[PDB]
Design a protein around this ligand. Sequence first.
Ligand SMILES: Nc1ncnc2c1ncn2[C@@H]1O[C@H](COP(=O)(O)O)[C@@H](O)[C@H]1O
Ligand SMILES: Nc1ncnc2c1ncn2[C@@H]1O[C@H](COP(=O)(O)O)[C@@H](O)[C@H]1O
Ligand SMILES: Nc1ncnc2c1ncn2[C@@H]1O[C@H](COP(=O)(O)O)[C@@H](O)[C@H]1O
Ligand SMILES: Nc1ncnc2c1ncn2[C@@H]1O[C@H](COP(=O)(O)O)[C@@H](O)[C@H]1O
Ligand SMILES: O=P(O)(O)OC[C@H]1O[C@](O)(CO)[C@@H](O)[C@@H]1O
Ligand SMILES: O=P(O)(O)OC[C@H]1O[C@](O)(CO)[C@@H](O)[C@@H]1O
Ligand SMILES: O=P(O)(O)OC[C@H]1O[C@](O)(CO)[C@@H](O)[C@@H]1O
Ligand SMILES: O=P(O)(O)OC[C@H]1O[C@](O)(CO)[C@@H](O)[C@@H]1O
Ligand SMILES: [Zn+2]
Ligand SMILES: [Zn+2]
Ligand SMILES: [Zn+2]
Ligand SMILES: [Zn+2]
Ligand SMILES: [Zn+2]
Ligand SMILES: [Zn+2]
Ligand SMILES: [Zn+2]
Ligand SMILES: [Zn+2]
Lengths: 319, 319, 319, 319
Amino acid sequence: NIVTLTRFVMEEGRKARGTGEMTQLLNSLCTAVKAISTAVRKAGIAHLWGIAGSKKLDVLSNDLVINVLKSSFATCVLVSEEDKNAIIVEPEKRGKYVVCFDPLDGSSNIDCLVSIGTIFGIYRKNSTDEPSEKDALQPGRNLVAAGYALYGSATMLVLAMVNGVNCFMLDPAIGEFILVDRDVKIKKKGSIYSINEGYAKEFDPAITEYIQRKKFPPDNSAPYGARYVGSMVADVHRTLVYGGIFMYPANKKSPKGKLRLLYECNPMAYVMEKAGGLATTGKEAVLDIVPTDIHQRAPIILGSPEDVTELLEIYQKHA
Amino acid sequence: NIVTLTRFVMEEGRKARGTGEMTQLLNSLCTAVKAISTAVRKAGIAHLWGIAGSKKLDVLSNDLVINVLKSSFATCVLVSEEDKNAIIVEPEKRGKYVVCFDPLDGSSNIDCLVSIGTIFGIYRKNSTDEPSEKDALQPGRNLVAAGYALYGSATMLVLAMVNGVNCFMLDPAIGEFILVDRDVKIKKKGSIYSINEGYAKEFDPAITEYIQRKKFPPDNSAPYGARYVGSMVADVHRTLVYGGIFMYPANKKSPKGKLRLLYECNPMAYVMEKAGGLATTGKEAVLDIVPTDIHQRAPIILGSPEDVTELLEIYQKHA
Amino acid sequence: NIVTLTRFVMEEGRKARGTGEMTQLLNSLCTAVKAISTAVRKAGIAHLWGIAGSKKLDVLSNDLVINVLKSSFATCVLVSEEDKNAIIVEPEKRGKYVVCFDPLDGSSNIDCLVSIGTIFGIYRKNSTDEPSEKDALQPGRNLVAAGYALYGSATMLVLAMVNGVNCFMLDPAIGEFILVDRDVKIKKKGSIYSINEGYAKEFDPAITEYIQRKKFPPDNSAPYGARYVGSMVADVHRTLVYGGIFMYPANKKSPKGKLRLLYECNPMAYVMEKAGGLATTGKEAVLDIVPTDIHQRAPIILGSPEDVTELLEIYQKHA
Amino acid sequence: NIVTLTRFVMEEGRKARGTGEMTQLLNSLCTAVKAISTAVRKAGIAHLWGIAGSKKLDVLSNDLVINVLKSSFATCVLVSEEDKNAIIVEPEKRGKYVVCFDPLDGSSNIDCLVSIGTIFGIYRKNSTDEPSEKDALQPGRNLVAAGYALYGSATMLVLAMVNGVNCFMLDPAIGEFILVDRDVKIKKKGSIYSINEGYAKEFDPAITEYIQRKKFPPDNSAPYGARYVGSMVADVHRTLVYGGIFMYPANKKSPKGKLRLLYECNPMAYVMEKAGGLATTGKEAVLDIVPTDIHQRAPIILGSPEDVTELLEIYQKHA
Ligand SMILES: Nc1ncnc2c1ncn2[C@@H]1O[C@H](COP(=O)(O)O)[C@@H](O)[C@H]1O
Ligand SMILES: Nc1ncnc2c1ncn2[C@@H]1O[C@H](COP(=O)(O)O)[C@@H](O)[C@H]1O
Ligand SMILES: Nc1ncnc2c1ncn2[C@@H]1O[C@H](COP(=O)(O)O)[C@@H](O)[C@H]1O
Ligand SMILES: Nc1ncnc2c1ncn2[C@@H]1O[C@H](COP(=O)(O)O)[C@@H](O)[C@H]1O
Ligand SMILES: O=P(O)(O)OC[C@H]1O[C@](O)(CO)[C@@H](O)[C@@H]1O
Ligand SMILES: O=P(O)(O)OC[C@H]1O[C@](O)(CO)[C@@H](O)[C@@H]1O
Ligand SMILES: O=P(O)(O)OC[C@H]1O[C@](O)(CO)[C@@H](O)[C@@H]1O
Ligand SMILES: O=P(O)(O)OC[C@H]1O[C@](O)(CO)[C@@H](O)[C@@H]1O
Ligand SMILES: [Zn+2]
Ligand SMILES: [Zn+2]
Ligand SMILES: [Zn+2]
Ligand SMILES: [Zn+2]
Ligand SMILES: [Zn+2]
Ligand SMILES: [Zn+2]
Ligand SMILES: [Zn+2]
Ligand SMILES: [Zn+2]
């Protein structure tokens, strides 16, 4: 009994007696992701190089996501990392949902062919007045659904909702996402730390001490392994499946961290918590932060509960 | 003028006036690569979860290459990371070439969907004696062709020969590798350092010093960025295209480093040198090491010349 | 504003306030069709011929259709051309729907690579007693939905329901059926007659006279063109889109015609009528015949209303 | 032993000791074919209906072949059914071969999704004079290679040369044509007749008599089955693999038949003869007709020897 994402979404829709609007939203998202996936794998690239004689992924992915979501008649406010201001869906195509997304995460890894993906956060419009940019300023805790598509060796879509986290593998032969890991839970403690040690000179005392323990454990256990793909979707997904910890904290030349709150942090923090993990800035929990700006940045620490807890305790140490 | 990998090798073969054996071998290598990519991308995976009522990638990739290479009738001896002993092709199928290959590099990244690939080195038989492992124990400097296939966001095959390095992007729609980067040359100096710092406790003084210098630059320049995918093929490719340095030096468990010389170090060292870069163990040149064990290991530091020489100088400073 | 079949099905489902059971049924059908389509195009055939060293489409298609439909939890009785008796779905997976289908039409065209397809008829269980083979013995007039997938130069899925007929093209790059012809209507009169003139010696007086008119028009107009692919799905689809007439009447050595009533005739008769066409046996209308046997055969004449009417009048001529 | 079309032509080239020019030409033909197939199958069609916010197959197929053949550097003159005049390749790209091709055969079947294909004939230049149309006006008997690509339920490329006929099935997953039928030989006698009977009023006495004999067999055998896809490539392929006869004789509009000699009749006549079959105008052998017009038409009857000779005898009986 094989489960396609389409069938899974539909069943979650009926079990919740939804009017069918969100179900359509998720089906469109899934369709947009397959269209980005094919573009990422370079299908039809030969024609680009004039195979029959006589654009950028970031822009194409964004266009695909915008149009597909508008055509779902399920959204009223869209927030993209590629648009300075929130997109207000045309009245005739409005739904009750607000979507925040990262059309193509890992830009610096684009040209070297390293893994990249798509991240999204789905919110229910919490008011009655006209759709505006503020409708997307809800804290992650309010998320109805969040997830991501990872374009690695294989394309995978991870979806998280109140019920839990599920991983679906894309079978490109039939354009179908197959459920291959149901109700996933991150392990209590991992053995991998992921962070750009390049900004070592700018790390606060906590991170600096935490890193040190990983390489030189006081209790003399085995040192953690290091892994940094350079793309949030990839590092995070490896975290969810192998366990461990992922980090992108602030630093002298980037006080509020680099990663954006609405379409990168919240989405991943939500997937992590629903998988039995933690996601913190170092002091407060990502999902509880009250967004003040659509493109606001936020420090983020996530992964296995024990590894994250160990770090939270070091922060208190330097409280 | 669109140029496919097929046309490219066929043309080189003619310029060189080869009898066609090496050309058929590179063509077979090309076919094997497309077959692995399709598998890695999970095509047909739906039949796995019985979409119609009802073999790991490592063994499959290995079996594909073996079968495809034997069937080329251009090889006599084969060395695989998956076989304890060298493989001697049956007489009826013997050619003059010796191939050393890493069917699926990046085993630890297989399940988390991170980039993986295939590495290969080709040598001509150097004796009239009956084929045996000896024929595979030549120094990298004798390679006639080397390269790899990266199965990342998209699939790319990098090929190097006496003339230079060329990158071919795979257009999966038509099953052709399109030439997208001619006679590639690495930047003299990069700004990215790649290594697993989890072995900090086991690094020697030079490596330690180099890494610190990358984080706290003496001339107070901006520190280098850190990147470590975990798959040699992925980190090495980013090094070739973006510039910088890649390192896997000796440690406790691996006093002579981890990576294998015949099918990992040499192929990447040949590619790196043909692109104007360097590849060293820290003491000598990778391509000049005469192996004595087909599964011999060797330390390796490679990438932009200026970055490598700087580390090389650290080594001789301590000596 | 592009419409995928998935979105179309969902919207037709909400507009009709359906519980969502039929919607799932149609999504599964659509998924099964893409899985048959990939198998028909021979994807992965290289592995069959041992590409990595060391079944029939009719059977595979049937398995795919059976399993996918059972997993929809939307059917109670299935009727396949490949099974002597109706399939009674397991109690735990029962839905209210009855499906009759031709998993792979055009068997004789299979080995010569000519177009083949899948035909289906969806019925609502019209009683209360236990699901039995009789639940599938309803006359086509009772059809809730009917259509077919044509695996020609390109794969297309034609779907007909009370509302009308729509054609969706399959974009294999993203495994998505795209609406390309909405509310299709066959033209009043065509200029192509399709029939196997091989059984000329066995045709009744009506057909014999009708054929003659096509070649030698009494009014001296231009003779009709002849076309006979040899596969019902192909000939019929060309009929729906180009107009004209398709015929498979009885004959001395096949008194009740060849084509089967439940999964070939009814489905196509329904698609035709909803497209403004006609489908007759020569006397009565296909959709009104009361099925007596699950694999009962029936003569069929279909296509443009004028061309079919012309033939019905010749029958009355020899009444 | 899996054999791809690439390996096959490369091997033949070696056995023949060619300089590699014809091999690169057949390799280019192979690439062009895969590019057309992908297009015919409608891959990427979603971008047409603006799935991301926003050229007929005949012109595209034509442009692909032209560009791909010119870029092979193996041709000097090209004849296409889509160009009024022969094409003379620029000096810098000139080879010794002359190619006559039918980029997309079966134009009337394009929109109804029925099987279509590409037909090609290859000749070596027969003079030292400057390239011109003359070089393309040689009798079929001079072909060095001919064949076609059928885009039916699956894509297949049939290739014929002095040695014989071989069929290669395209595995779209890896973009390779796999040898699935070696040294093909047509049945001495078939049981299928293919022709458009709509021109009955215009057929000559022999054709008329033959067709009647096929329906009412004198020896009272079972009548032949009728089949006419409407695309020469499709009907001819079924004739080669199942046996039987294919016909397109003269009529009012086309007194010298319809099908073109250079890129339709000859290629199929060469293939049919190399497979032990016959191809005649009814009076002489197709391959021996010396053309005088690149777009010259010719009557053609081809298929199983016994079936063709029987019709040939009808012709001489009347004469
Ligand atoms: N496909 C679905 N999967 C999960 N929850 C759903 C689904 N459809 C509806 N829901 C739940 O029902 C609420 C209302 O759905 P809707 O009427 O479609 O906007 C959503 O906010 C979800 O909490
Ligand atoms: N396709 C090719 N590309 C580059 N060099 C080639 C090629 N084919 C042959 N050669 C060179 O010619 C030598 C002999 O080729 P072969 O006669 O095919 O064994 C090889 O060892 C290479 O040095
Ligand atoms: N997706 C749909 N498209 C068209 N009609 C539908 C759809 N879903 C439901 N219906 C109609 O509603 C009836 C009951 O639907 P259901 O409750 O899903 O079995 C069906 O028999 C159809 O007449
Ligand atoms: N791949 C091949 N398959 C069959 N015959 C070939 C092949 N390559 C060359 N030949 C034969 O050798 C002749 C000269 O080839 P070339 O030197 O490549 O122009 C051709 O005209 C054919 O007769
Ligand atoms: O080079 P840096 O600063 O480590 O950037 C890495 C981060 O940047 C991003 O590309 C920005 O979204 C993330 O995907 C990734 O985690
Ligand atoms: O986990 P570690 O010790 O960093 O080793 C990773 C290395 O091992 C390999 O997977 C091969 O063993 C390489 O691809 C990669 O560079
Ligand atoms: O060879 P015949 O008798 O014309 O059979 C043709 C018919 O047979 C079938 O293959 C049987 O389903 C139909 O698809 C097609 O219309
Ligand atoms: O419609 P008609 O007159 O039977 O012609 C069909 C023939 O024409 C072609 O389409 C080429 O003109 C052939 O492929 C086919 O055999
Ligand atoms: Zn991002
Ligand atoms: Zn982004
Ligand atoms: Zn390796
Ligand atoms: Zn390996
Ligand atoms: Zn059938
Ligand atoms: Zn059937
Ligand atoms: Zn044609
Ligand atoms: Zn044509």
